[PDB]
């Protein structure tokens, strides 16, 4: 009875009642220009599709964008924020690309464009601020990253691993993070909230191989997020 | 019981068997040099006292060090990391003082020393890394910062950076921090049955509802499990 009385408590949980839930934008970068020096990302496509599928399961509108340049990425993001989220309860943004640690004020890390030009996670998040995007005002804004005064609110960012470090793959079973995220979400998204799920993910992904991969979270959420399912 | 299971699941929750739970250092900068320009964080003595009884009640060997310089803070910290938390289950660091925002590579944030010189959160978190302190390896390492004004793989680190101005009594800048007061109350009511992350969400919501043209505590986590504090 408690679980149903919490999930329904609007002061402790973000009520995800609309159908569909919101937009989910997956940006998939695999092929990098020669000058950058970034190795082709084998398997990123199997990951992409797992996620596309998963968030669809979770009732989102998923659009994928493959191989985009720094300038095109920021253009998709501005486009997304430019939308009318009025009738939506949430918004998701996934970025499957190469990355690194970047100097920041609020949100760490940067992600590479197919052109090798970086984009700060921080710049990505803010594109979704209340001024530029009042439709998502007050609503949870999630950010999933598989890499290497408009006060920011309800911003959630998960990192395949603390920026600067290594994310371990396996072109066939998929990268640990995306695979584990898909699995755990499959298992529990119906009875468990976003932060609990990411705990299982982090813990799970933490027991593989020599080098330990360590999924991150940088949150400014006010309530627990329970994904809609079926 | 669902919660009962949750609490006792070693895979889903950092089990706290020992007693005490660990060390807790609260640095409390109240009086800053005049050149700093930074005002006297009065009322902070009330905040600090509330927090030391809170973490005390949470089973920690709390130690309070007030008015430290950027260097003495780094020293006070360096010390805590030289200890052998080996038999302990978790470590806590609370920092009350003025803070300044600055671009950084690893972690965001910085707190002001009594001298007026900044100490980046990056450096604070790093001081407790696996190497410099294996004693706390794999164990939960908590950092609560309340600062108005704003290959050692990182693991089991948790940083709560609040910058919520606002007193317990708005008419009196010396009544204490509304954030602290609010967090403390939240702990008094749910610690006995809600994990760290859940407690702080309650707090986050209370803050957002309290003020609007104000930010909200930013959390950064590398925890692998839930943390149910010891409460007797």
Numbering used by the authors:
A (entry chain A): 140 to 287, 335 to 416
B (entry chain B): 140 to 289, 335 to 416
In the authors' words:
The essential machinery responsible for the execution of apoptosis is the caspases, a family of closely related cysteine proteases. Supporting this hypothesis, caspase-9 exists predominantly as a monomer in solution and exhibits a basal level of catalytic activity.
To generate a potentially dimeric caspase-9, we replaced five residues in the β6 strand of caspase-9 (Gly402-Cys-Phe-Asn-Phe406) with those in caspase-3 (Cys264-Ile-Val-Ser-Met268), using standard mutagenesis methods. To solve this problem, we mutated the catalytic residue Cys287 to Ser and were able to crystallize this catalytically inactive form of the dimeric caspase-9. The structure was determined at 2.8 Å. First, the dimeric caspase-9 exists as an asymmetric homodimer in an identical manner to the WT caspase-9. Just like the WT caspase-9, there are two molecules of the dimeric caspase-9 in each asymmetric unit, and the crystal packing interaction is identical. This observation also indicates that Phe404 is not a contributing reason for the observed asymmetry in caspase-9 as previously suggested, as Phe404 is replaced by Val in the dimeric caspase-9. Second, despite being an inactive zymogen, the dimeric caspase-9 is nearly identical to the WT caspase-9 for the core structural elements, with a root mean square deviation (RMSD) of 0.4 Å over 380 aligned Cα atoms. Third and most importantly, the conformation of the amino acids surrounding strands β6 and β6′ in the dimeric caspase-9 remains extremely similar or identical to that in the WT caspase-9. Thus we conclude that the impact of the five-residue replacement is naturally absorbed without any significant structural rearrangement, and that the dimeric caspase-9 faithfully mimics the dimerized state of the WT caspase-9.
